[PDB]
Design a protein around this nucleic acid. Structure first.
Ligand SMILES: [Mg+2]
Ligand SMILES: [Mg+2]
Ligand SMILES: [Mg+2]
Ligand SMILES: [Mg+2]
Ligand SMILES: [Mg+2]
Ligand SMILES: [Mg+2]
Ligand SMILES: [Mg+2]
Ligand SMILES: [Mg+2]
Ligand SMILES: [Mg+2]
Ligand SMILES: [Mg+2]
Ligand SMILES: [Mg+2]
Ligand SMILES: [Mg+2]
Ligand SMILES: [Mg+2]
Ligand SMILES: [Mg+2]
Ligand SMILES: [Mg+2]
Ligand SMILES: [Mg+2]
Ligand SMILES: [Mg+2]
Ligand SMILES: [Mg+2]
Ligand SMILES: [Mg+2]
Ligand SMILES: [Mg+2]
Ligand SMILES: [Mg+2]
Ligand SMILES: [Mg+2]
Ligand SMILES: [Mg+2]
Ligand SMILES: [Mg+2]
Ligand SMILES: [Mg+2]
Ligand SMILES: [Mg+2]
Ligand SMILES: [Mg+2]
Ligand SMILES: [Mg+2]
Ligand SMILES: [Mg+2]
Ligand SMILES: [Mg+2]
Ligand SMILES: [Mg+2]
Ligand SMILES: [Mg+2]
Ligand SMILES: [Mg+2]
Ligand SMILES: [Mg+2]
Ligand SMILES: [Mg+2]
Ligand SMILES: [Mg+2]
Ligand SMILES: [Mg+2]
Ligand SMILES: [Mg+2]
Ligand SMILES: [Mg+2]
Ligand SMILES: [Mg+2]
Ligand SMILES: [Mg+2]
Ligand SMILES: [Mg+2]
Ligand SMILES: [Mg+2]
Ligand SMILES: [Mg+2]
Ligand SMILES: [Mg+2]
Ligand SMILES: [Mg+2]
Ligand SMILES: [Mg+2]
Ligand SMILES: [Mg+2]
Ligand SMILES: [Mg+2]
Ligand SMILES: [Mg+2]
Ligand SMILES: [Mg+2]
Ligand SMILES: [Mg+2]
Ligand SMILES: [Mg+2]
Ligand SMILES: [Mg+2]
Ligand SMILES: [Mg+2]
Ligand SMILES: [Mg+2]
Ligand SMILES: [Mg+2]
Ligand SMILES: [Mg+2]
Ligand SMILES: [Mg+2]
Ligand SMILES: [Mg+2]
Ligand SMILES: [Mg+2]
Ligand SMILES: [Mg+2]
Ligand SMILES: [Mg+2]
Ligand SMILES: [Mg+2]
Ligand SMILES: [Mg+2]
Ligand SMILES: [Mg+2]
Ligand SMILES: [Mg+2]
Ligand SMILES: [Mg+2]
Ligand SMILES: [Mg+2]
Ligand SMILES: [Mg+2]
Ligand SMILES: [Mg+2]
Ligand SMILES: [Mg+2]
Ligand SMILES: [Mg+2]
Ligand SMILES: [Mg+2]
Ligand SMILES: [Mg+2]
Ligand SMILES: [Mg+2]
Ligand SMILES: [Mg+2]
Ligand SMILES: [Mg+2]
Ligand SMILES: [Mg+2]
Ligand SMILES: [Mg+2]
Ligand SMILES: [Mg+2]
Ligand SMILES: [Mg+2]
Ligand SMILES: [Mg+2]
Ligand SMILES: [Mg+2]
Ligand SMILES: [Mg+2]
Ligand SMILES: [Mg+2]
Ligand SMILES: [Mg+2]
Ligand SMILES: [Mg+2]
Ligand SMILES: [Mg+2]
Ligand SMILES: [Mg+2]
Ligand SMILES: [Mg+2]
Ligand SMILES: [Mg+2]
Ligand SMILES: [Mg+2]
Ligand SMILES: [Mg+2]
Ligand SMILES: [Mg+2]
Ligand SMILES: [Mg+2]
Ligand SMILES: [Mg+2]
Ligand SMILES: [Mg+2]
Ligand SMILES: [Mg+2]
Ligand SMILES: [Mg+2]
Ligand SMILES: [Mg+2]
Ligand SMILES: [Mg+2]
Ligand SMILES: [Mg+2]
Ligand SMILES: [Mg+2]
Ligand SMILES: [Mg+2]
Ligand SMILES: [Mg+2]
Ligand SMILES: [Mg+2]
Ligand SMILES: [Mg+2]
Ligand SMILES: [Mg+2]
Ligand SMILES: [Mg+2]
Ligand SMILES: [Mg+2]
Ligand SMILES: [Mg+2]
Ligand SMILES: [Mg+2]
Ligand SMILES: [Mg+2]
Ligand SMILES: [Mg+2]
Ligand SMILES: [Mg+2]
Ligand SMILES: [Mg+2]
Ligand SMILES: [Mg+2]
Ligand SMILES: [Mg+2]
Ligand SMILES: [Mg+2]
Ligand SMILES: [Mg+2]
Ligand SMILES: [Mg+2]
Ligand SMILES: [Mg+2]
Lengths: 52, 112, 117, 137, 154, 101
RNA sequence: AGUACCGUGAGGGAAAGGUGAAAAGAACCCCGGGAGGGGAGUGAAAUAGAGCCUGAAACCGUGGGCUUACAAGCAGUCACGGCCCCGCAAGGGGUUGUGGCGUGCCUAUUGAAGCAUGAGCCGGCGACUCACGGUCGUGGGCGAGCUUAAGCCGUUGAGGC
RNA sequence: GUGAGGGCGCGAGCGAUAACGUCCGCGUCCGAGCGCGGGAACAACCGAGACCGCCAGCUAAGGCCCCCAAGUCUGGGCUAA
RNA sequence: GGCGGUAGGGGAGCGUUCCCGAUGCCGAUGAAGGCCGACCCGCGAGGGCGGCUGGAGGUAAGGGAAGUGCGAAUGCCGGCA
């Protein structure tokens, strides 16, 4: 409401463009020594266990 | 052959779940399952629950084998919004718009 | 006897709205921005129409000029010989002979050579 | 309907530059740069002849010029209007002198920049011995 | 804008508000507000010159007559208000029903007859009006009714 | 045999019998008309006078009929002036036949 | 519904209608905590499944065709070409690479693209009327005449006096 | 309907033989011809009054070396900034 | 042969709601409306035809009466950005 005010309604084209890098990035998982379940790297896991 | 599964009226912003959906866009059932299992988002919970049931329908209603189905396509849709009030300085009221979502997940048979 | 706005407006809109379908963002979705777009375009057509003539006029002359120029002479020289030899024949357009049947163009050039003197 | 040209092979050209008036030369270089000299002209396609100039430094110029002529190089910075006399150019990279000339004569259009590529300039002579070398004056 | 429940108070001060500018909601530009120039009740009639009134009635009866449909009648065997009788008469009169008829008679029993009959319209002797006349294909009236018709115009 | 011909104010070459489209003309539906207007030929018919003397290009009027309806429309600003005029040009389907010069 | 709500108070004052011929309004099973879906069953129809007939626009979305990271623009228009798509062909449609040309709409003004006004976008509401009298034109009746007013008789969308 | 007019050339007052200054007059364009060509762009300067079409043709102003259509035209002089 | 045009005046027409035409006619072999169109006719506003939706109304020719066409009013109500 104060000095900071947008001049024009950002075109729906520019909006989407802005959100370019906005996309997500899939998590990282690897097979584990116990089951075949995919544990996150450098981590234990429920219903799996560990050692030492 | 394909098996749909939509979760209408879900308290959550489409934009937020859209991210979740786009992750499993055209992926193996198991492949997707793992993504949802460890992905760090609230939209995960929902996209998962629906995607899951989608398989249930594929099997028990469309003679599709779990071990051979992927994500032919999937998308989320924007539903009716819950407008609310918001007390503001100098006595101003503004409408906070808690939108909702219609998560449409569909599967399909692989190849031959 | 009330007269509901009924259907008229919407139809008038969607009517023009489609004539402009294909433009930019709101410029081809908002009933009205499209109109404005069409307003200008409508005029563009009329001017560009008389332009379409001017276009080919010179366009041809470019070909022609460089054509007889290859035989060694000016376009002004070229034409003068023709207009003097009394031959509307090669209307600027059909001077494209420089591409189709160049020999024909040659003789026309030759005729122009002896035309002047 | 007016002739509709198609794909044409690049006709290279070898042009001198000794004792040649900077302008009088660049003109033709530009004229021929685009296929404006070939009766089968067409602005749309851009099919000009690959023009290569040799003996750049040799170029002649009239009056004060060498001492008069001034070139303008403005960087986006305050007081970056750095300007260079003609002579200096002939000292540093002389090839420019003709380049910027022809450059300023090719159409301002983006395909004109594409025609700028069809323009190779050195001073030796000795060009990149490729193939074509149709000498001209 | 007058007869509308809305108040007469001003909605905004019309100053340093940032809003448009209005008085009460009764303003036409207030969806629901008073109609702008809505038609109020009023008569649509006037006083058409008597001469014309008759002149028409004349040319009217004269037209359908000129074409050849003005059948003057008298013999009405229709003892009572029993449609059957009328259609039985009309049948033997030349009214198979292929032409709409305007029945002008003094007898109120003859009314009853063609009263319900769809392809016919009953009417009083004085009831002669240029509309119903030029509204049918055939005109058939009681001779006695043709007398009172001669009274207004003969 | 490139034989030029001017008609309807505009001229153009003529292939030995081919489908052409020219300005509307006053001729029967499927008849044949001659266009003495001829310029040049296939073996260099130098057009002595503006139009070649003894020569003629004859074609068969394949008929008439209007064409694409172009749409003209004027508009000047800051002034309530707007015009929307529809227009379409008629023509004849002159099917080229004989090109005897 | 003078309700909700707003105002100490007098007072102000909303929004909000529709499944389907019939409720036959969806038994049972499947995923799911539920909501919700999926299959089955109902119906002529379920994109008639429950603020459910029709269901437009702005607006958000998914798949496809065309296009784009050496580009400078009121966004279009004219031409050429390439891609894709309908037709036997000629032809046509969708898209835009390059070249040409090009200062938005309304208002207000001597004068605006204007760094003057108004407009986020869409859809719906919105502004020259009616009565009496006057005046000029006009169609028709009648003519040195023309015409009725209130009302009365009649009718029940008949006229006449 | 209009009763703010404006620029321009010319003839005058005021001004300072100032002002995209101002006040009358004669005419002109703009207004309302921001439609087109020229003038780099540009309401009024030069050309010229757009009923619509056309991938025809001469010309106007201006222009005819390259961006740019069309002469590096022809002949004779001047000017080295 | 005239046909740029604001304020203006004048002329012709299109579409919307209802009325007579109607005890009629079109209509579930599909009404009104919605969606699409490169076809058809008209200078045009519009009119027509074809496919799709839709599910019960609609209304010629020729006439009549108007709550009769919106892009703007920091206009109004709603919906969405
Ligand atoms: Mg998008
Ligand atoms: Mg994404
Ligand atoms: Mg919760
Ligand atoms: Mg089952
Ligand atoms: Mg809904
Ligand atoms: Mg706060
Ligand atoms: Mg908001
Ligand atoms: Mg309205
Ligand atoms: Mg409109
Ligand atoms: Mg198009
Ligand atoms: Mg012309
Ligand atoms: Mg050649
Ligand atoms: Mg020195
Ligand atoms: Mg020195
Ligand atoms: Mg410093
Ligand atoms: Mg420095
Ligand atoms: Mg450009
Ligand atoms: Mg009141
Ligand atoms: Mg009141
Ligand atoms: Mg009240
Ligand atoms: Mg009041
Ligand atoms: Mg009041
Ligand atoms: Mg008041
Ligand atoms: Mg008051
Ligand atoms: Mg104020
Ligand atoms: Mg009201
Ligand atoms: Mg009301
Ligand atoms: Mg009301
Ligand atoms: Mg009255
Ligand atoms: Mg009256
Ligand atoms: Mg009166
Ligand atoms: Mg009856
Ligand atoms: Mg011969
Ligand atoms: Mg119920
Ligand atoms: Mg169910
Ligand atoms: Mg449910
Ligand atoms: Mg449930
Ligand atoms: Mg359930
Ligand atoms: Mg269903
Ligand atoms: Mg539907
Ligand atoms: Mg339904
Ligand atoms: Mg449903
Ligand atoms: Mg219920
Ligand atoms: Mg609901
Ligand atoms: Mg619905
Ligand atoms: Mg309903
Ligand atoms: Mg119903
Ligand atoms: Mg829909
Ligand atoms: Mg809905
Ligand atoms: Mg998408
Ligand atoms: Mg996409
Ligand atoms: Mg897409
Ligand atoms: Mg660069
Ligand atoms: Mg590139
Ligand atoms: Mg540019
Ligand atoms: Mg194909
Ligand atoms: Mg085929
Ligand atoms: Mg084919
Ligand atoms: Mg073809
Ligand atoms: Mg093709
Ligand atoms: Mg094509
Ligand atoms: Mg195409
Ligand atoms: Mg398409
Ligand atoms: Mg530009
Ligand atoms: Mg003002
Ligand atoms: Mg002002
Ligand atoms: Mg004015
Ligand atoms: Mg601006
Ligand atoms: Mg502005
Ligand atoms: Mg201001
Ligand atoms: Mg002001
Ligand atoms: Mg504003
Ligand atoms: Mg706002
Ligand atoms: Mg708003
Ligand atoms: Mg708003
Ligand atoms: Mg609107
Ligand atoms: Mg609106
Ligand atoms: Mg209205
Ligand atoms: Mg109105
Ligand atoms: Mg009056
Ligand atoms: Mg008087
Ligand atoms: Mg009078
Ligand atoms: Mg009168
Ligand atoms: Mg009269
Ligand atoms: Mg009279
Ligand atoms: Mg008369
Ligand atoms: Mg009279
Ligand atoms: Mg008379
Ligand atoms: Mg009755
Ligand atoms: Mg009634
Ligand atoms: Mg005054
Ligand atoms: Mg003076
Ligand atoms: Mg002044
Ligand atoms: Mg002045
Ligand atoms: Mg003057
Ligand atoms: Mg004027
Ligand atoms: Mg004038
Ligand atoms: Mg004038
Ligand atoms: Mg303009
Ligand atoms: Mg100019
Ligand atoms: Mg100009
Ligand atoms: Mg003409
Ligand atoms: Mg000429
Ligand atoms: Mg000149
Ligand atoms: Mg020039
Ligand atoms: Mg000389
Ligand atoms: Mg006129
Ligand atoms: Mg005039
Ligand atoms: Mg009319
Ligand atoms: Mg009735
Ligand atoms: Mg209706
Ligand atoms: Mg319909
Ligand atoms: Mg149409
Ligand atoms: Mg139809
Ligand atoms: Mg159906
Ligand atoms: Mg339909
Ligand atoms: Mg009706
Ligand atoms: Mg109204
Ligand atoms: Mg308007
Ligand atoms: Mg509005
Ligand atoms: Mg505002
Ligand atoms: Mg606002
Ligand atoms: Mg609002």
């Amino acid at each position: 409401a104060k000095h900071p005010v947008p001049k024009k309604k950002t075109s729906k084209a520019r909006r989407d463009a802005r959100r370019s890098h906005h996309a997500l990035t899939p998590p990282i998982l690897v097979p584990c020594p116990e089951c075949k379940a995919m544990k996150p790297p450098h981590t234990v896991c429920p219903e799996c266990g560990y050692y030492a | 052959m394909e098996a749909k599964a939509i979760a209408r009226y879900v308290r959550i912003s489409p934009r937020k779940v859209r991210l979740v959906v786009d992750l499993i866009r055209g992926k193996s059932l198991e492949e997707a399952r793992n993504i949802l299992r460890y992905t760090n988002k609230r939209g995960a919970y929902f996209v998962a629950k629906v995607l899951e049931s989608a398989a249930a329908n594929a099997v028990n209603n469309h003679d599709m084998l779990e071990d051979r189905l992927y994500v032919k396509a999937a998308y989320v849709d924007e539903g009716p919004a819950l407008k609310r009030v918001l007390p503001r300085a100098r006595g101003r009221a503004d409408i906070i718009k808690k939108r909702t979502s219609h998560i449409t997940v569909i599967l399909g048979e692989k190849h031959g | 006897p009330r007269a509901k706005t009924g259907v008229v407006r919407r139809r008038k809109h969607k009517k023009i709205l489609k004539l402009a379908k294909g433009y930019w963002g709101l410029r081809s979705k908002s009933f009205r921005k499209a109109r404005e777009t069409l307003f200008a375009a409508g005029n563009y057509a009329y001017a560009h129409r008389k332009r379409r003539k001017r276009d080919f006029r010179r366009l041809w002359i470019v070909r022609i000029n460089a054509a007889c120029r290859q035989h060694g002479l000016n376009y002004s020289t070229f034409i003068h010989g023709l207009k003097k030899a009394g031959i509307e024949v090669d209307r600027k357009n059909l001077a494209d002979l420089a591409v189709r049947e160049p020999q024909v163009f040659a003789e026309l050039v030759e005729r122009a050579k002896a035309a002047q003197g | 309907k007016t002739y509709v040209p198609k794909q044409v092979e690049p006709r290279w050209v070898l042009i001198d530059a000794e004792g040649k008036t900077l302008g009088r030369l660049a003109t033709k270089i530009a004229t021929l740069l685009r296929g404006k000299h070939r009766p089968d002209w067409t602005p749309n396609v851009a099919m000009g002849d690959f023009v290569v100039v040799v003996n750049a430094d040799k170029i002649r110029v009239t009056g004060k010029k060498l001492e008069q002529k001034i070139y303008t190089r403005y960087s986006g910075y305050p007081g970056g209007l750095k300007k260079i006399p003609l002579e200096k150019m002939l000292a540093t990279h002389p090839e420019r002198v003709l380049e910027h000339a022809v450059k300023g004569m090719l159409p301002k259009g983006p395909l004109g920049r594409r025609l700028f590529k069809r323009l190779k300039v050195y001073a030796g002579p000795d060009h990149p011995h490729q193939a074509q070398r149709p000498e001209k004056l | 804008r007058g007869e509308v429940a809305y108040s007469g108070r001003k909605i905004w001060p019309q100053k340093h508000t940032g809003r448009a500018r209005h008085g009460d909601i009764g303003a036409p530009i207030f969806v629901g507000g008073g109609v702008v120039f809505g038609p109020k009740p009023r008569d649509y009639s006037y006083t058409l010159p008597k001469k014309v009134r008759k002149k028409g009635l004349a040319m009217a009866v004269a037209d359908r007559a000129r074409e050849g449909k003005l059948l003057l009648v008298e013999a009405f065997a229709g003892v009572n208000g029993k449609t059957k009788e009328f259609l039985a008469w009309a049948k033997e009169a030349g009214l198979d029903g292929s032409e709409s008829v305007l029945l002008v008679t003094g007898n109120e029993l003859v009314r009853r007859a063609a009263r319900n009959l769809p392809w016919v319209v009953t009417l009083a002797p004085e009831g002669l009006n240029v509309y119903d006349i030029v509204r049918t294909e055939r005109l058939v009236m009681d001779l006695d009714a043709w007398e009172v018709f001669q009274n207004r115009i003969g | 045999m490139f034989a030029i011909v001017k008609t309807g104010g505009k001229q153009y070459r003529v292939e030995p019998g081919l489908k052409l489209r020219v300005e509307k003309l006053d001729a029967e539906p499927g008849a044949t008309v001659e266009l003495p207007v001829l310029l040049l030929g296939g073996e260099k018919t130098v057009v002595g006078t503006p139009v070649v003397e003894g020569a003629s290009v004859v074609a068969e009027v394949l008929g008439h009929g209007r064409g694409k309806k172009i749409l003209v429309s004027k508009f000047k600003a800051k002034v309530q002036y707007r015009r929307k005029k529809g227009h379409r040009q008629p023509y004849t389907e002159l099917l080229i036949k004989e090109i005897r010069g």
